[PDB]
Amino acid sequence: DITQSSKAPNPPYSQLFNSNVVQLVQNYAYNTFLGAIPVDAMSQSLMNFVTDKVQGNSLINNLANTTFKYQNFSAPSSGADGKITANGLIDQSTASTYLNDPVSQAVFNILGTPDYSFCMDNEQKNWLPNCNLMYQNLVMQNVIGTLPPAQTSGSTPAFYSYKYNQPLISQLNSNSLIAPLLMDTSASQSGQDSGLTAKSQAQQALNFIRYASAQVTPPSLPKLSAYSELWNQATAKPNSAGYNEVQQKQAAATLSSYFNNLRVYAAQTSVGVSNLYYILSKRLPQNMSADQSNANITSQALNEFNMATRRLFDPTASNTPGQPNQQWIKQINDASPATVQKEIAILLAEINYQMYLDRQIQERILLTNSIMLLQNLKAAQPTADFS
Amino acid sequence: AILLAEINYQMYLDRQIQERILLTNSIMLLQNLKAAQPTADFS
Amino acid sequence: LVMQNVIGTLPPAQTSGSTPAFYSYKYNQPLISQLNSNSLIAPLLMDTSASQSGQDSGLTAKSQAQQALNFIRYASAQVTPPSLPKLSAYSELWNQATAKPNS
Amino acid sequence: AGYNEVQQKQAAATLSSYFNNLRVYAAQTSVGVSNLYYILSKRLPQNMSADQ
Amino acid sequence: SNANITSQALNEFNMATRRLFDPTASNTPGQPNQQWIKQINDASPATVQKEI
């Protein structure tokens, strides 16, 4: 309506509504995307996203494994703070401290959880009085805790009673992993102190991942007697010290067979375990501000949701006319064509980034399906003999 | 502009469904591998 | 032969002095990075510079790209090749099959 | 009280084995059950107005 | 002698997140090649249309 300047926008507006907040959101989104994605954590040079030739290499590489670095996953927390940490009950130690990546922790659990026979004598009859290394039965009992009784009693509940399963139901529930957008690592509760138990929401999700990935039942490594016999058979120099060659080679083949099957199983399981930990770590808190007394805590999923829905509805935004920072739709309703055009440009950039994330998930799906199909085909190997 | 915001939100929903797909596939692959634990029997 | 070359020298049963046990962290320290799935899909540009040297016992990786490639080799069951027919049985069957009949 | 440690540890291992298998099965099944209930709850009625 | 090493995934990431944040972009006002959002904040309608 071009008749008077009174109803014209005074002062005119040509810029975006607020470039500061949106730019902050984009920067946090970049930081979350580079931090949340799990990174193989064994050496500084192994976690690098890019080499030294990429411009901005230091910033990109520094954001590797941020979620667990902030969570102090390597440090064996006692659970009083309820942080995401390697629990000593089910994670193998590094001395006959813990590994910096949960997926490499799972791989190490699969590879080096020794059999219970290593805590028993040579003939497998008695138990040694002192045995400080965790065997499969030991870690598995540590998961279970004190064995619940059969019939319910006043002192202790039955294995099927609701009182006994009060924390277990939450621990094994799948929604503990995918429902929340930002895990709460504060220990606001304390479950029953009988073996493996979670102390907070994030610990509940981590325990659910532990249960669903079958990390509470490690594979059975070879017995002490049998492995010792096979190794002495297969390592001694042939035709010397009372040994031969054909039998030694057969023993070596058998031992390498077990080891290669174990390694293949470890890698194939690690694919899914890293998948689960990618799902979880999308929702773990991450530090952004250089200030360590008043930081900025947000996660990939929380920031991602805020990015998706900072224009449909925003609880922070004012809901009464006359106040600033109204809803995005209301601001659009009274905005200049240049401003809404720039908003459209920003929205298209958002769409592009979201499509990139969706394709990353699709790539994850492809890896999962290919690994499982290859496992099926390995189980379906052709037979050579003709009978 | 509002249509583009809608498109962004729908893509977010599609992403969430894809993540659910990924969780399902990963859990089922873990079950398949747990059914195929490498045995230590040497005899 | 290939499968031994993968396994290198067979680790001992229970010791962590001169040589590490098959379940000790010292023995597994280079293996876990190879077997970890994140060694393939986490980085965006592999490093092809030998910044480390694993234990010289069979198949080992010298850099991040080697770690990812070895992970693919392990997860694709290329370290346990299929069993081809025995020499004697295959020779007998081929002799029985390629010979012109009635002669 | 008429017990040893080898048999006790073996029995404890067996009981913990059953319990761990049951917990793993429950946790793995909960993924699919929660997915089904997500599909259902996508279509379930929810009130919106602050008043009732 | 003028090699420029890049990968499909790295370039894909750079394409996806060049306009969100850029570590090579100046973060101080008054400097060239600054962040994409700030450049949009001052661009002409034709320029933002071409960027769209």
DSSP A314-366: -TTS--STTSSS--HHHHHHT--HHHHHHHHHHHHHHHHHHHHHHHHHHHHHH
For residue A307, the chain B residues in CB contact (below 8 A) are 8, 12
Helix H or strand E segment including A298: strand A297-298
Q: How far apart are the C-alpha atoms of C46 and A377, rounded to whole Å?
A: 29
Neighbours of chain B (3+ CB pairs under 8 A): A, D
Cα A65 to its chain centre, rounded Å, is: 11
d(CA A18, CA A2): 28
Per the CB < 8 A criterion, the answer to whether A216 and A210 are in contact is: yes
Question: Mind telling me how many Å the CA of D20 is from chain A's nearest CA?
Answer: 7
The 10 Å Cβ neighbour count of residue A135 is 22
Phi, then psi, of C16 in degrees rounded to 5 = -140, 35
E2 touching C, CB under 8 A? no
Looking at the complex, report in whole angstroms how far the Cα of residue B15 sits from the nearest Cα belonging to chain D.
15
Which of the residues A174, A177, A275, A313 would you substitute to probe the D interface, choosing the one with the greatest number of D C-beta atoms within 10 Å? A174
d(C-alpha A330, C-alpha A308), whole Å: 17
A365's CB contacts (< 8 A; 6+ apart) are B18, B21, B22, B25
E6 touches chain C (CB under 8 A): yes
Contact A303, A32 (CB under 8 A): yes
Residue A5 pairs in a beta bridge with none
Contact criterion met (CB < 8 Å) for A26 and E21: yes
Query: Which among C36, C40, C52 has the least Cβ separation from residue A104?
Result: C36
Mutate which of E10, E15, E21, E39 to disrupt the A interface (most A C-beta within 10 Å)?
Answer: E21
Residues in chain B: 43
Taking an 8 Å cut-off on Cβ atoms, the answer to whether A344 and B1 are in contact is yes
In this complex, which of A174, A275, A372 lies closest to B22 when CB atoms are compared?
Answer: A275
CA distance A316 to A273: 37
Would you say C28 and A94 are in contact if contact means Cβ atoms under 8 Å apart? Answer: no
Closest CA to E13 of E21, E4, E5: E21
For the record, the structure tokens of C49 come out as 């510079």
Q: Is A39 exposed, middle or buried (0-12, 13-18, 19+ CB in 10 A)?
A: buried
Q: Does C25 touch chain A (CB under 8 A)?
A: yes
Tokens in use for A229?
A: 């016999």
Broken C–N links (> 2.5 Å) in chain E, after residues: none
Experimental technique, in short, is cryo-EM
Beta strands in A97-213 (DSSP E): none
Token pair listed for A56: 């901005």
Q: Does B15 touch chain D (CB under 8 A)?
A: no
Q: Which of A49, A227, A261 sits opposite C43 (nearest CB)?
A: A49
DSSP letter assigned to residue A222? P
Are the C-beta atoms of residues E48 and E19 closer than 8 Å to each other? no
- DSSP H helical segments within A185-312, as ranges? 201-212, 224-235, 246-281, 300-308
Determine if residue D2 is left, alpha or beta; phi over 0 gives left, psi from -120 to 50 gives alpha, anything else beta. left
- Please give the C-alpha separations between residue C9 and each of A100, A235, A236, A281, A292, in angstroms, as whole numbers: 28, 8, 11, 38, 49
Based on the number of CB atoms within 10 Å of its own CB, is A188 exposed (0-12), middle (13-18) or buried (19 or more)?
exposed
Percent helix, strand, coil in chain E (nearest 5)?
A: 45, 5, 50
Residues 6+ apart with CB under 8 A from D51: none
User: How many Cβ atoms from other residues are within 10 Å of residue B30's Cβ?
Assistant: 24
Cα A140 to chain centroid, rounded: 21
Question: What residues contact C80, with CB distance under 8 A and at least 6 apart?
Answer: A257, A260, A261, A264, A378, C3
Is the Cβ of D28 closer than 8 Å to some Cβ of chain B? Answer: yes
